[model samples]
Target chain A: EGFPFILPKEKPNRPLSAAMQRNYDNYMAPRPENNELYTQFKYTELKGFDYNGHDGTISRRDPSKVIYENGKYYVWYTYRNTPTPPQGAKNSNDTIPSADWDLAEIWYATSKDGFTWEEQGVAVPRPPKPNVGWRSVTTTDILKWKGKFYLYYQGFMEASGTRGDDCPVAVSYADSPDGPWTPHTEVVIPNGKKGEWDQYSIHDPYPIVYKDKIYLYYKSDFDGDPNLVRMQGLAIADNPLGPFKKSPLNPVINSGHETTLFPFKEGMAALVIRDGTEHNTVQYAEDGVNFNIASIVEFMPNAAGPYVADAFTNTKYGRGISWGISHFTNATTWDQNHAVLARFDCDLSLDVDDPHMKRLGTYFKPEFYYQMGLSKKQRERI
Target chain B: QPEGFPFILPKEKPNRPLSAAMQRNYDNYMAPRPENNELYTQFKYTELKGFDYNGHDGTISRRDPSKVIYENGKYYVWYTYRNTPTPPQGAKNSNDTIPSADWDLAEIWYATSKDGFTWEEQGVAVPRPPKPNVGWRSVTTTDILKWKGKFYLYYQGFMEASGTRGDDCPVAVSYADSPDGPWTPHTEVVIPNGKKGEWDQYSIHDPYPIVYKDKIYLYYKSDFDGDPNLVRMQGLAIADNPLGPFKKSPLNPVINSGHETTLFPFKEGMAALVIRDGTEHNTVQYAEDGVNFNIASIVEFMPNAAGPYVADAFTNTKYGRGISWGISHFTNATTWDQNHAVLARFDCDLSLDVDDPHMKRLGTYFKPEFYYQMGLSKKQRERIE
Candidate 1:
């Protein structure tokens, strides 16, 4: 018999960089999603929180946006209340209150080191109760550019109608994150079928400046096939607040469902979409026109609060985290509790240096980063 | 002043002449298989294919004893290809052998297959150099390896110098970075000069390079310094790299077999070798290293039934499988004919630690039919027209 020899070795003790630590701290923020190991770090129904006379389901709350105006992180998000459940319904059932809804207020949370948070009062109040004067209020995205913090969201209808299903787009602005903000009293873009692509509804609004031109991207169902709902598109003026025009390029990332997009280097962009059942995948495009699978990272269940779908980013902290947001898993109807801000990490170095590539005589080196996952029991304890 | 143990004329005659009967007991003692039965089983008749040239009868052939290597899901036989004649296409008789055609020029050929049984011939994998009068006018007796995606072919070559036949000598070489290549010539020959006026000194050939532990062993045939008649002696060289500038072993001529040389590892601590048994005897020898050999008592006094006579003996990996080349002996009435390859499968269930005095013959003459098909194939004959 041949004798077996054991080789001695040592474990690596690489320290986490400051940027990586910051990313980890942000990702580990208190949330139901962060508590669940495999659940995508999204806002989930915090089991017993009440909303609209019903138990509330928490979701992807865009991590409070921070402005470095006076050395502080200004975070803004929509705080929604769950509606009352049917009279005889029990708390254990998986039923939500009702579709007709409103965000009680757009709230602000602040941080000094971009790590610890302190909640501020409502940034935007609930629409006055009643059908005629004020309607629904809920936000999709928020950003600070130039001298103003632009808030884009959706407004609901006074009474139940197909119009409420079409969550019309709205905009508001503030000089400071803690704001006495001004918003367009009337709907900016009505949430109705305007064409084959935008036939369902226009809701979640994400606006960014590309090539000095403002491009507004919103969430909508497939105009050509309403059964297929994903992130759709609309472009407008250079102004952050505008009568945004729609682009011919609708549903840029046709994942048949809501997806995420971010600007990358070299005229490129990345799209993050759900890969069914458990995880999400990120695709990269050189010209924002054609995309290929760039990397994949498993979403730890419950890492994000309820209703969050995915997070996408072009850059990553050394420990592999990216900042993004997604919605609750079952938020087909715009439940304000179904969205949350979350962090993600991905590693793809093995593919970049595949020996098969070396054997085939092509040289390529790709950088990859990895994210650690929490155990189910650990997450439950959290 | 003669050296210490010089061969001086005998001082006196001995009274008694030792009879062959007295040596029989010692021979019988050497005959039994050792306690290391499994190792003895692996070494029994274990051999790989090889090549040599004795003037016009130059040919490529196979020996049964070999090992298996699995790569890309295929089995390859790193064996010797013997020179075989090709039949002229569209001839009245397909059996007619054409002379003067370079088709019979033997070089190492590789045959690959998903299964060991059916094989496809990979013809002339490594070829002789194109330079006129350069020493390597022919290539033979090959061994192969696939490393880092490149196929390495190590074989023996003979070069002609100034138009003299005796000037031809053996040298080892490497080919292009392809198993199937427009091959590359070796920058330098591994072994060049042989002993002066000696059989092998006129040639340095038959290289078997294998990896052992961290070092590489190059087992080759040469006649340097010691052998008065320059009989085939297996010597070793060591190198850290596969593509080498090797250092010769301080203990040279590991196996100084009087005739015929083939040396390969048998088991962990032993090696096996085969040599020509003159006149009344043909035998196999085993050694700890190539240097010290113990001759077994068993002998095949008659030629094998496969074709003519055995050239080299080899053992298969499993139990009782042995292979050898059977050549037709030259005769006045019946000239040498039916020279071909044969495999012998031994039936004895032998092991390294168990001693088995008798080994049963499994199969006798196994020959390949592809020899005739190679030269007359559509591709090969296409140029003849």
Candidate 2:
């Protein structure tokens, strides 16, 4: 028999044992007291925040990273001026041209509570001279370490004569959160070999400190492929400014392009963009390298950011008990190709074995269990 | 009846048809609108306005001043640059850090000035060719003209010129729905070379286009064969639209004694600013038909440069139709030569009488009371203040 143990029959000769009866009763009427170990997580969308510039044009997107410090939540993002003509001109069908992608500037905002944000102008304007290599700076992540704030971003420094597609990861540090950010002249993480896995370019850097190592996670193409099909890679360094080495088990996550990670109870939780087998899935990694899908989250539009609470630890299901902030487009009455900040609340206290588990049973597959066991064995061999 | 109590209504309508009298009234109403005649008489002073940044090694020069435009409450100007920093990855020729005498290595640049003095340079508006792969090599002497809320950039492209003069120079145009462009380049020659022996036979360059009524008038500079002196004359071409199947004006050498073709409509006629060959050679010419031109005045201190702020339909009337162009010690220098040029603003105040009814209506709408009543609906009229 394929079973690990013998099953009791309904015949009189094989009258039910107490253990089997207990199992049957528990399956039929599971008590919340007994199912305290199982927890279900979900995100509920909330009203978002709008950031309007002086010109009446607003653009805020890619809440790349958020940090809670000094009782305030600071979210840095890519911001630009969205072209919005006058009200009378719009009614007349005037096509007022908006700013182009070449003009992206890095901006930040602050919130007393995580919901409402007050824009704090440009954080890193495109570097001025000899540093002219970087034309546009975008997709930023922040880390506050050693009483200094470190800002990591992807810079698109299109070579003077070529068309495009030359990007590299750059870093800057400042004394205060509201920064006079001093940019690092050299690129932090250059692209891999031309035909290697993490080649063409690396972008959307999400850096976290785990076990005294700075784990820098970024999105890149496969073997210098120019297509939008991107994968994630991790690099480890001893310090914030790194002589970083790419992980041997590279392309740590195969799905999703945005490398969004937050410290949770189980090492780290990543919000993977909808791609491949993963559709808005929350993936957890114990060692910060081997990630597995924990739950399929409701689709959050664009780049979704979860709040990293101050008291959070790098343990399983550690954070995301309360609300987090993501971004949504069309946040205001007049916005085009612009994103507004959004807040979301997630409940991680509901037991996983509740009534909805029977309906969501298909998501839990036997193959996943086998894969998880196989991955653990492989890690042991390593 | 009383002595003059019964005023007869126009004795049987006074026209062959109601349409004729209506057309006459419309023509008369449109003709008396404020022309920039005051600009010429009132414009007296000029000043040196320097741009914010000088390109690599303090040798970069800004030239080819496109008419300054006031839009969305800010002023924008476009020009051509010579020795700006090379793009990253050495997009230009060799990665030479120093400035070189490469006139064919120019890019079109733009800047915005709020108070018409302090300028902020927005980077390259139009980059030079990625490599010398096409027939046209480098872009220079550009003019950004706006028509119907769309921007059309007209510039000169030299065909792989080793020195200053190229093999064949042609006028090309690029257009964008917005001033900040994902500009679509139309490589087709806007104004092809003149026929075999007809004055401007060898090359055409420096295009300046203006819209008058229903047609677009394009003015350009051309030469006989590659000689700069013999056929350096300003010519006019008329088209029904901005992108044109333009026919050359019968008066070919319209302004016979000029190097640059800068013209703008003034009063009921047009004004032309011509750069003479040497010092004290700045001439302001007038054209009633935009073809036959004669010099109105020649200024002593004004440099030999054509930086006229052309008055157009989109011009802010409050600013007045004055001239703003680059002025430098090397104004009448050789073609494609670099100069440390600064923008010059000249203001005109046509001595308009504020008490005059027409003068008061310059900034206000024509027949505002009539148009206001005509534009109001029953609901809108009820809520009028």
Candidate 3:
């Protein structure tokens, strides 16, 4: 009520130039009280799926992307049909033949509002090839650009020899959002070099358009130890239908598995799900490639597969840039993993340089770093 | 004043020279009294009962009950069902078969109740016709009328070849001598769709039929291009008999807006209840003639349960002619296409007096003795006084 904070004519360490400081001041100016009272996000569960063991299907997971256009909100996800074996079962003797990874296919749902979705049947079917090779598709992301819609997903091809570690990212496109999509004949992002950090697999493609360039973020593992070390990497493209190039600073964010990012004020923000030593966290980067932890996402437990609204300002319902959707998995077995989608609300008014800024702890400890064959100095560099 | 003079007034004239106080009393008695004006200009409802049952194929979904009727010492209700043994099979294309494309692929089902609450499922009343029949695709949203010892069922039929509009929805009628019948099917369009540019040019649905005087009044909802927002209005057709060479009323759309066409005979006029759309979206409207409806009262929360009883002479037995049973959807989701619905009996009671003091005074001043005295006999008049 008394006065606004003003920048003084003094320079400090890593200081901005005078013009840059003025731009920063304008960007950080406090908003009016009316604007601060923007509506917060709320969510309710969609019908048709049983979170308990009632309907017998094990899980619906990886809710790919939610897009609001033309007065409707469309959602896509991967559906698995393996029935959970009864508790205390001695063996697979009496169990239904579980197809954990083989039966996954992409399904679609829609809503007039962001909640109350209607299941709209299957969008992409599992590949018709033999069960041993490139059998299913999952972990989907959608991009609509230049009047064309592109669907990027992970294809679980047969293991590189027998290890089940050679999943690759693929693309499909359609003229309409509700599609009869034409699958691209080949994988877009293959595994990294034989001994490289991302040699094992590349999956979970999250594509965002920033400054007219497509930045596709993904998760990968180290060669020879596919499941032990998981990290996120980046690829850049001039067109959505891309012959893409990997970023020089390859493993841009090394904390989480899901490639969840959206454009924030002048840069981009990413939600890092729990992997290694990192709890769920939100990270930010001005240049879209190099990201640093911004805040700890403490409220979302077991949350993965995050998606945020792309606009930096309020669009509908005075819901200022404050919320995103993600899924929570509650699984005891690889075949019994049941998951449901949820939306998260947060405060977006914090500054990047605020000393009290939120953090979800460092990504990895020196002990864990040493185990991954890195020295303490090399781990500190990461 | 003589003691007998006040009580001895004749129908046409009084044989007494009345005092000023007596003249004032007589004048007030002859005027309109509001208490005896028994017109149902308002309504209130309570949930009657809940019913859930598996159909012949073991899946349960009840929706859009026909007008409940009392016959042979029990109440009978017919509804729409999508619970077939095998899920409807066809090419997965809307252009190929509208029936297979949506959840409206349903058959007309039946149930009976003794107390108008607990219902016993009576299985499929009118199953989908065999292949090559016009109604082989699906039958949905039916209305039943009992006239002169015969049961006439009017239903909407959709076939694969019926295009998007033209002939896509043909309202047909079938007759049975008994409520449960080896029913006889009639393949002709009773109330045909309008011409190319007319308001109801494409499809007509949700039939509500009533017998007034010697003619049959068939009330229905129609649209210009089968789209809800294009021209969804309530229209009326009149026929000299139950099976009509029916003529569309020159006052075609009786109500300017509304989706479902549900009406019942009440007092000396007719009453209608509409669902979801229009100026009076969920209001009980009254009309002296079958057309020209006005809002009698507004209903705060009526779902897509628009079927109301078509009252007859015996309908006044329990509550009144205005009291009848209708079905309301009973699922947690918010869509017109629901998987379950329950029958609820609605009562339109005029005996429940109005709340306004002015209206109350108007009602008291217009009692039946003062307003409707021409039909009273001398004995009846003497007793009334």
Error of 1 at A195 (Å): 4.9
Interface RMSD of 2: 47.3
Residue A134 displacement in candidate 3 (angstroms) = 82
True contacts kept of each: 0.00, 0.00, 0.00
Q: What lDDT would each prediction earn against the true structure?
A: 0.37, 0.52, 0.53
> What tens digits encode model 3's per-residue C-alpha lDDT throughout A244-358?
7777556666456667776765577666655522324456666777665443333331223333455312222211234344564543443454555554333353211211112
- Best first by TM-score, ranked: 3, 2, 1
Task: List the candidate 2 regions with Cα displacement exceeding 4 Å.
Answer: A1-57, A82-101, A129-133, A159-166, A223-227, A310-321, A329-335, A348-382, B1-385
- Deviation from native of the Cα of residue A138 in model 1, angstroms: 1.9
TM-score of each: 0.34, 0.38, 0.39
Across B110-210, the per-residue lDDT of candidate 2 in tens digits comes to 77777654667787777665544333456777786787778887777656542433446567777888776767777665776666555566656678777
TM-score (C-alpha, index-matched) for candidate 2: 0.38
